[PDB]
Design an enzyme around this catalytic site. Structure first.
Site, PDB file in Angstrom:
ATOM      1  N   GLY A  92       0.790  -1.225   0.000  1.00 56.87           N
ATOM      2  CA  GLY A  92       0.000   0.000   0.000  1.00 56.87           C
ATOM      3  C   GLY A  92       0.829   1.286   0.000  1.00 56.87           C
ATOM      4  N   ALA A  93       1.800   1.363   0.895  1.00 56.30           N
ATOM      5  CA  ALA A  93       2.637   2.551   0.980  1.00 56.30           C
ATOM      6  C   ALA A  93       3.819   2.279   1.872  1.00 56.30           C
ATOM      7  CB  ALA A  93       1.836   3.739   1.499  1.00 56.30           C
ATOM      8  N   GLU A 152       0.726   5.718   7.413  1.00 50.44           N
ATOM      9  CA  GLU A 152       2.103   6.180   7.228  1.00 50.44           C
ATOM     10  C   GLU A 152       2.383   7.426   8.076  1.00 50.44           C
ATOM     11  OE1 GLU A 152       3.627   3.953   5.930  1.00 50.44           O
ATOM     12  OE2 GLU A 152       2.105   2.937   4.738  1.00 50.44           O
ATOM     13  N   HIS A 192       3.234   6.565  11.743  1.00 52.58           N
ATOM     14  CA  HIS A 192       4.592   6.047  11.839  1.00 52.58           C
ATOM     15  C   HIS A 192       5.560   7.137  12.264  1.00 52.58           C
ATOM     16  CE1 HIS A 192       4.856   1.878  11.054  1.00 52.58           C
ATOM     17  NE2 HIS A 192       4.447   1.906   9.798  1.00 52.58           N
ATOM     18  N   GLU A 216       4.655  -2.108  13.604  1.00 54.68           N
ATOM     19  CA  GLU A 216       3.501  -2.229  12.725  1.00 54.68           C
ATOM     20  C   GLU A 216       2.169  -2.441  13.454  1.00 54.68           C
ATOM     21  OE1 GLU A 216       3.624  -1.194   9.981  1.00 54.68           O
ATOM     22  OE2 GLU A 216       5.763  -1.197   9.593  1.00 54.68           O
TER      23      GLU A 216
HETATM   24  C1  LIG Z   1      -1.827  -1.493   4.180  1.00 51.61           C
HETATM   25  C2  LIG Z   1      -0.923  -0.895   5.274  1.00 51.61           C
HETATM   26  C3  LIG Z   1      -0.958   0.637   5.214  1.00 51.61           C
HETATM   27  C4  LIG Z   1      -1.458  -1.345   6.644  1.00 51.61           C
HETATM   28  O1  LIG Z   1       0.446  -1.370   5.131  1.00 51.61           O
HETATM   29  C5  LIG Z   1       1.136  -1.023   3.989  1.00 51.61           C
HETATM   30  O2  LIG Z   1       0.572  -0.533   3.012  1.00 51.61           O
HETATM   31  N1  LIG Z   1       2.462  -1.217   3.938  1.00 51.61           N
HETATM   32  C6  LIG Z   1       3.190  -1.806   5.076  1.00 51.61           C
HETATM   33  C7  LIG Z   1       3.646  -0.716   6.069  1.00 51.61           C
HETATM   34  O3  LIG Z   1       3.801  -0.980   7.256  1.00 51.61           O
HETATM   35  N2  LIG Z   1       3.799   0.515   5.580  1.00 51.61           N
HETATM   36  O4  LIG Z   1       4.271   1.610   6.622  1.00 51.61           O
HETATM   37  C8  LIG Z   1       4.263  -2.575   4.624  1.00 51.61           C
HETATM   38  C9  LIG Z   1       4.023  -3.895   4.255  1.00 51.61           C
HETATM   39  C10 LIG Z   1       5.066  -4.693   3.797  1.00 51.61           C
HETATM   40  C11 LIG Z   1       6.355  -4.169   3.707  1.00 51.61           C
HETATM   41  N3  LIG Z   1       7.343  -4.947   3.281  1.00 51.61           N
HETATM   42  C12 LIG Z   1       7.200  -6.235   2.954  1.00 51.61           C
HETATM   43  C13 LIG Z   1       8.391  -6.688   2.588  1.00 51.61           C
HETATM   44  C14 LIG Z   1       9.217  -5.656   2.707  1.00 51.61           C
HETATM   45  N4  LIG Z   1       8.498  -4.619   3.145  1.00 51.61           N
HETATM   46  C15 LIG Z   1       6.604  -2.850   4.081  1.00 51.61           C
HETATM   47  C16 LIG Z   1       5.552  -2.052   4.538  1.00 51.61           C
HETATM   48 ZN   LIG Z   2       3.531   0.434   8.817  1.00 49.90          ZN
END
Ligand SMILES: CC(C)(C)OC(=O)N[C@H](C(=O)NO)c1ccc(-n2cccn2)cc1
Ligand SMILES: [Zn+2]
Length: 886
Positions: A265-266, A302, A305, A324
């Site tokens: 997602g981000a 985000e 965070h 997380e």
């Molecule tokens: C959908 C949401 C916002 C809960 O999580 C994400 O879109 N991305 C997460 C994250 O914590 N973003 O701050 C995410 C998920 C997987 C990874 N990741 C997976 C393998 C390497 N990195 C990194 C970030």
């Molecule tokens: Zn996150």
């Protein structure tokens, strides 16, 4: 194939104080020059200096400006750079290197890569080593000074962390920008962006210090008008962290950037947040309703965070759930507050109990803090994230708002961090709450270390003469591969007692603290036999066995004050019915019966649904939940050797039973809801979002689906009129419900035309088609492949075509194995350029050992085939090896 173990954590024998980066982007290559101001740590013991470095082409490396020689002084195997200690200094020294990398051809979307015409980085968790040499671990804190150069025509906007301190022209139509970011940070929070970016902007003035914060949101020029909601969400996020937590943004600028190609997602980086376009961009005309809640949660996520990402550094990746889980919890609080709809909390519970529960009883089961890993890219699970958040949420349930906020403050102030540090912080609040310094949260730590979903069951006793009510509670967790003996958890049980005569609460807010394998909770002065309202808000991530009769459940459904208990009571009534009808269909199939009986759906239950549906003061979102059977992936947790065809028949019978009674009610509501649901008053106001109105559309579109499947007289008229709606949620719904009619390919063409000129909208269209309930769905997928998808490496495109299809119970699980074969082919094809997304596409296989004997064999054969592929990535291999218990 090294396995990293949590017990073996040891600080690095080196230190990196300063990073000085020069990233020069060219047409066919990117040159990265790096100088690392390093030192020797107090843990050093004369070992080799080993840097992480994956896929880097070395031009030269040095120490103190003297070039090193390969073979004699250093080795490099495309993964680790080893500089022998005899050539490594014993005081402060400079390491430097120049490497060539190739973002143009980086289709794994990790490290530095090109998305469309944007160059962007993704460094969490171990992507920075793909950009340059480093001790790529989250406890290596350093200062960063970064210069980027590129062709000014192609890359006019250059971004990285910190402050842009210099901008300079370069001979040959190139230019450069320098960013200095003095505060220490981990390398996974490094980011760089370059492209022809357009932006919207705003200024936010913080609540307390009154500092002005500049907010920028970027996209490619084509979609810049889809950025306003994201900007609004960002304002909302800053304000919420202020009001709820008292936290102001630390910096003077915040950048959000959308790219088309992104694995998740981000990603938060210090001051510079990078997003999947589908989680930042939206317009009323070119997005379905779901996008608006999605952008709000991801932008909020985000953002939350940020404050903790400063001050708090993870010791190591085993503490990921602390980062997380806490953020998902904060994100969930934000979303509930912003949406003000009960379906927000319900949707999170719906997610946990389907997807995460399935994971937690699969061979992939792990605790939210695992004891080992092979691949960090496989560490980011619904268990780590969503069970993580529920464990973070339980602290609030236990402590209440005031003491929770006190514990959170302690954690930040007092604090590299571990899950234990958070627990300790909350424990201090716990002591203060119960006014008992002997009180502790030691048992709570089991939530971090113990895998599997606890089962909580109940028995009751009422003594009418004594006015005395007892709730007897039991918990247990099934043994699995992580623990032979499971210990009892600290389980907070939020409860009420409902007077069945008048629907009134009989006791004040009460949270039972279950800390033993079993306990008996007694209440005096209970004037009449109550109906217990258990795990209000879904107060613990457990299987609830309420031992209530359907009559009691119906009474809760109608009259209880808690949305989750009402919804759960409904769910439990459905589950009892599903299990009964399933077993009746199963016996008929096994015994080859010529005739047999089915238990009808409870008539008072159907009356209760009608009662609620006809209540104009009741909530539309909640209404859409009650007319929907529980998710297949929730159901499957309750059935051994599930025959998916028999489950399909079971759902069909139950939906038919209820529709045969309520379809006229459904049709009437579908019509009377139109005006408010599809109200266009604020359609051209880019910032006006109404989550109640979107819930009304959800309800209409749910009812339309029920009416279409049932072939309700002349419903096709409503479907055709629906396709003309300005709302994509409506006219995409018109497509999928038209599946049951001849007019499908007509609407297929029409909706394709509407979708094709917007990249994100096209993906929603692909999803709609992919999940269409068509008998010719295999031919239809083949069409999508040849005509629309082709050889796209865009994860959004690929996931859009295939994942929804895999939820087609009757078709994906076709007994020939054709569906399993198809997805395994896609996984293997994907794995050649993007192993992370290849692993994502394995998701349907996660329930393989829960199915009937033939389908187990079919799935297993396909996974074994994938495993046999000579060119399989380490990522996919490890995952399939764990999943197939090999
Ligand atoms: C959908 C949401 C916002 C809960 O999580 C994400 O879109 N991305 C997460 C994250 O914590 N973003 O701050 C995410 C998920 C997987 C990874 N990741 C997976 C393998 C390497 N990195 C990194 C970030
Ligand atoms: Zn996150």
């Amino acid at each position: 194939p090294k396995i990293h173990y949590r017990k073996d954590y040891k600080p690095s024998g080196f230190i990196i104080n300063q990073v000085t980066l020069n990233i020069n982007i060219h047409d066919q290559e990117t040159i990265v020059r790096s100088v690392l101001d390093m030192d020797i740590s107090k843990h050093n013991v004369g070992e080799d200096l080993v840097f992480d470095g994956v896929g880097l082409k070395i031009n030269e490396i040095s120490i103190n400006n003297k070039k090193l020689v390969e073979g004699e002084e250093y080795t490099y195997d495309n993964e680790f750079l080893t500089i022998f200690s005899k050539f490594v200094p014993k005081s402060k020294f400079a390491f430097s290197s120049e490497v060539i990398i190739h973002p143009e051809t980086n289709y794994a979307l990790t490290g530095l890569y090109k998305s469309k015409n944007i160059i962007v980085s993704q460094c969490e968790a171990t992507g920075f080593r793909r950009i340059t040499f480093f001790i790529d671990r989250p406890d290596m804190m350093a200062k960063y000074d970064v210069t980027v150069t590129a062709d000014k025509e192609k890359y006019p906007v250059l971004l990285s962390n910190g402050d842009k301190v210099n901008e300079f022209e370069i001979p040959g139509g190139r230019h450069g920008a320098r960013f200095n970011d003095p505060p220490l940070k981990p390398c996974y929070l490094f980011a760089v962006v370059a492209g022809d970016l357009k932006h919207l902007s705003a200024t936010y003035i913080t609540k307390y210090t009154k500092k002005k914060v500049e907010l920028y949101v970027f996209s490619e020029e084509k979609y810049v008008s889809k950025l306003q909601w994201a900007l609004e969400c960002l304002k909302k996020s800053m304000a919420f962290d202020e009001d709820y937590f008292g936290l102001e943004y630390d910096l003077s600028r915040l950048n959000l950037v959308a790219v088309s190609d992104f694995n998740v997602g981000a990603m938060e980086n210090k001051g510079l947040n990078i997003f999947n376009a589908n989680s930042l961009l939206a317009s009323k005309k070119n997005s379905i309703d779901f996008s608006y809640a999605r952008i709000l949660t991801v932008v909020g996520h985000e953002y939350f965070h940020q404050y903790t990402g400063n001050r708090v550094t993870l010791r190591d990746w085993f503490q990921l759930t602390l980062k997380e889980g806490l953020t998902v919890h904060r994100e969930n609080l934000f979303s509930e507050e912003m949406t003000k709809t009960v379906t927000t909390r319900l949707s999170h519970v719906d997610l946990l109990r389907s997807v995460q529960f399935l994971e937690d009883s699969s061979p992939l089961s792990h605790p939210i803090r695992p004891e080992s890993y092979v691949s960090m890219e496989n560490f980011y699970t619904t268990t780590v994230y969503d069970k993580g958040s529920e464990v973070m949420r339980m602290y609030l349930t236990i402590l209440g708002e005031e003491y929770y906020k006190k514990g959170f403050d302690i954690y930040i102030k007092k604090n590299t961090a571990t899950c234990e540090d958070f627990n300790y912080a909350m424990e201090q609040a716990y002591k203060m709450k119960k006014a008992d310094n002997s009180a502790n949260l030691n048992q709570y730590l089991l939530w971090f270390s113990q895998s599997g979903t606890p089962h909580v069951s109940f028995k009751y006793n009422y003594d009418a003469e004594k006015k005395q009510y007892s709730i007897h509670v039991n918990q247990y967790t099934k043994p699995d591969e992580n623990q032979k003996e499971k210990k009892p958890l600290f389980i907070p049980i939020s409860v009420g007692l409902i007077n069945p005569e008048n629907g009134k609460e009989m006791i004040s807010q009460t949270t039972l603290e279950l800390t033993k394998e079993s306990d008996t909770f007694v209440f005096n002065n209970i004037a009449v036999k109550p109906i217990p309202s258990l795990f209000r808000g879904f107060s613990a991530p457990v299987y609830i066995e309420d031992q209530l009769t359907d009559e009691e459940r119906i009474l809760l459904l109608k009259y209880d004050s808690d949305a989750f208990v009402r919804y759960n009571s409904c769910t439990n009534i459905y589950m009892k019915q599903i299990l009964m009808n399933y077993n009746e269909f199963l016996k008929a199939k096994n015994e080859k019966l010529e005739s047999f009986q089915l238990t009808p759906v409870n008539a008072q239950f159907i009356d209760a649904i009608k009662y609620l549906l006809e209540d104009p003061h009741a909530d539309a979102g909640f209404k859409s939940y009650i007319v929907s059977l529980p998710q297949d992936r929730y159901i499957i947790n309750f059935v051994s050797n599930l025959d998916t065809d028999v489950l399909a028949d079971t759902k069909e019978y139950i939906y038919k039973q209820i529709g045969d009674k309520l379809n006229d009610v459904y049709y009437k509501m579908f019509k009377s809801l139109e005006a408010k649901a599809d109200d266009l008053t604020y359609f051209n106001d880019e910032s006006h979002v109404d989550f109640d109105q979107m819930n009304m559309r959800t309800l209409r579109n749910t009812l339309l689906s029920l009416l279409s499947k049932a072939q309700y007289p002349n419903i096709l008229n409503e479907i055709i009129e629906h396709s003309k709606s300005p709302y994509p949620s409506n006219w995409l719904t018109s497509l999928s419900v038209s599946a049951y009619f001849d007019k499908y390919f007509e609407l297929y063409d029409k909706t394709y035309k509407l979708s094709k000129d917007d990249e994100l909208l096209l993906q929603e269209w692909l999803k709609t088609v992919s999940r269409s309930d068509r008998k010719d769905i295999y031919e239809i997928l083949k069409k999508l492949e040849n005509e629309v998808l082709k050889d796209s490496k865009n994860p959004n495109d690929i996931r859009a075509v295939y994942l929804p299809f895999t939820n087609n119970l009757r078709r994906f699980h076709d007994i020939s194995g054709k569906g399993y074969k198809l997805i395994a082919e896609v996984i293997t094809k994907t794995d050649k350029f993007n192993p992370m997304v290849a692993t994502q596409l394995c998701e349907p296989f996660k329930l393989w050992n829960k199915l009937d004997t033939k389908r187990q064999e079919l799935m297993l054969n396909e996974m074994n085939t994938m495993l046999q592929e000579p060119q399989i990535s380490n990522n996919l291999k490890e995952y399939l090896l764990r999943l197939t218990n090999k």
